Design a protein around this ligand. Structure first.
Ligand SMILES: [Mg+2]
Ligand SMILES: [Mg+2]
Lengths: 251, 251, 251, 251
């Protein structure tokens, strides 16, 4: 407890699923949190479900919107003071092979999944460096940052990009003594209402040939590794990949 | 010799440097080759320097140009018959940290380095599958597909994307018995006229803390691994990463 | 706090350095701990420095001693009840290239660094499986489990072995629903009294070409990732590699 | 053709399967070859099946026998002149989980699979360095050097050790300008008479969840990557891992 004392976090796609669990555990550990999402009705309800406005607020934002990133950092500083912590979690999927990926699908996925993490990481470095905040940028990749899936071509591209781009940012921040760390988190299959809405998905993901543990994870599994990475407990971790996948990538 | 008997190869950025060496060794090994480049004066001279038009021709193309990919495959089939082999080699660099990367620089680099490889891989699968060609797509990544460089943020993103996207394509092609392989090649530092034009670059690259062998490679070092991957010698290799880097990534 | 409620941990080489910090943070988080070491004078003093015998005790043991592993598990159960948690941390180094490694040096290093982790992991699975303990085996590898060092040949062999052997154990435990996780921790350079005793070592390790952060870590940097892995917070993490290295392996 | 002009190769376990195919393609490419094996009846027949004694000879040797390595290098120099090329291919498997691995099984597997590669690599560096031979040490790892198999615990340990130890040797040889390269080859499932003798094995290995290509490889698939690595074509490749696995590790 109080593991995130004084931390001020932005979590993109923080209104649902993994992002909401990260926001929930962040507030529990003493962080101030701004969550983002596309819909104000969902986002304001999600903030209120976690805590009071002195603990957590909502900011409506598409991670692909470059100018909106400026407004997001400005809104978070006004509410909570200087931002110490960014979780780039907002993401979309396309269920296509490379072969069957339309160019519009490709561009839209990379706008959210790659441009979003680039915009957030670039602005985060500028706003958080040289302030003694113990600043941490946590870029959400996935098992699809390590291994191919034949039906997630564009997604694989975006997750491989986030994985290695994050190492560039980590090195630059370390060599320049910016007091900013950059790490990637790589979830395997995680049970969310969205997974619950695709009949057969959880059973398919739970097969031993997919997830050796024979079941999928829960949003809190990703929340706890993010608390570690946001905390000063991980002050010697930068440029690293943290996998929580029930053994998916070990076989 | 005759290691590429009957193969028909497209090599993007085949008019200079690594691409020109791949084209040269491909023709030597019995492949028909279409090289691409931005300038007709350079490209036609480069084709003529390797062989006769019955062996190698030039096609003017920016790898970022989606519609031009169609014209490139059509031109290669008309000259040489069905394409068996694609080397996605065309690439550009931006010398910026993530922090100092302009959005226009970011978009332009990903247009050539990521869109280019996606357009080529997608069209290549469609044109080469189910024809018993022993088809091979060779996607040029680099050491920057494995490790960060603090001053190559966008480049790291593009090379990490190509690395993992290529595994998606490899798996889909394998599971569907397309008779198409997809592999990545990861050069370290290679001496080219372009490296020779940056004073101090070769010495910096040749430092033991960069390249343990204490010298950089030559274009033929990349040509020979590409001959292996284009040939039926590698018919059980797909979804794999082939590193030729003088030990850069081993330390 | 109370993050290791009810956990019973064995930590090999727990009387000094990283092992002592893991033991210290384990007790702080509510775990009962048995630390091992070669010397009773050091080990008993180390236990007393952390807490009372109801919290932490010492057991004299060489990790290479197969029969002594039985006595270690028996002693820990008698003191604390069923063992939930094993940290295989005991290790030695040889400062030789492969070329200059004597066979006796080779065998002795692999006896502690590889046999030790095998004996501990094998016995740990047998004693901890199917008991609803939320059991966790944490095998200490290092950056030398990922990358070569020209002067640590035998050490590289042992750390590469622990890295991949741990994935085998993880998969078997997951597929058989043993309620046992196996993960590896990969420290970079960590300041210890032993590092302080080699003049010039910390400066050499702190060079940007070695550790991008430009300084080395402290034992608590490894303690905190071990608390995460021992805790039920990591119940979906198995077969994974957790790197805490100041950016060493990111470049 | 003549890709191994003037090369003098030792191939351990060169009398059967993958080793025999490497020996066959080595002789075809102009290398002189000494193959090793346990039985003189098999070994002499295997040598004669490939070529004349001026091309290839047999030397009876257990790779775990340290003193016999000296006699092997002496016999090869006497027959063929200075050794340029070592393929550490001799290996055994144990079909046990870590949990079910007997200590005698463990020690015997590591004696052949790890001690063997260490003895060969150490002696090879000493005998081949500083002679302008374009010397190459090719250490046979496997897919089990990258990923766990729950029923190959000891094998995983040995293959992870060879993988990272080989990088140490590569770096030392590069930094000291020894004119010796060290690389690892990582076969997936390969059809051999031994695989043909285990009913159901090839079908199990050929499942899409194991080998995406839906079939296993043949010994020549490993022979061709070994020709590349032995040849001066790979003179900028050291400390690298070459995977030929039908997509096993890409998913
Ligand atoms: Mg896998
Ligand atoms: Mg490195």
């Amino acid at each position: 407890s109080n593991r995130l004392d004084g931390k001020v976090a932005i979590i993109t796609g923080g209104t649902l699923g993994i992002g909401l669990a990260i926001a929930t555990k962040f507030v529990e550990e003493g962080a101030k949190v701004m969550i983002t999402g596309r819909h104000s009705d969902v986002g304001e309800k999600a903030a209120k479900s976690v805590g009071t406005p002195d603990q957590i607020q909502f900011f409506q934002h598409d991670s692909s919107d470059e100018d909106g990133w400026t407004k997001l950092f400005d809104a978070t500083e006004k509410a909570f003071g200087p931002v110490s912590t960014l979780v780039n979690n907002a993401g979309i999927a396309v269920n296509k092979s490379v072969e069957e990926t339309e160019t519009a699908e490709w561009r839209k996925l990379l706008a959210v999944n790659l441009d979003g993490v680039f915009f957030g990481t670039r602005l985060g470095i500028k706003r958080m460096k040289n302030k003694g905040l113990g600043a941490s940028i946590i870029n959400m990749s996935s098992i699809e940052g390590f291994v191919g899936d034949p039906s997630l071509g564009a997604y694989n591209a975006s997750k491989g990009a986030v994985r290695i781009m994050s190492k560039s940012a980590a090195l630059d921040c370390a060599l320049k003594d910016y007091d900013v760390r950059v790490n990637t988190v790589h979830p395997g299959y995680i049970k969310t209402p969205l997974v619950d809405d695709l009949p057969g998905a959880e059973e398919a993901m739970s097969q031993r040939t997919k997830t050796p543990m024979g079941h999928i994870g829960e949003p809190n599994d990703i929340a706890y590794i993010c608390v570690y990475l946001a905390s000063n407990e991980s002050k010697f971790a930068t440029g690293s990949e943290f996998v929580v996948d029930g053994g998916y990538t070990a076989q």
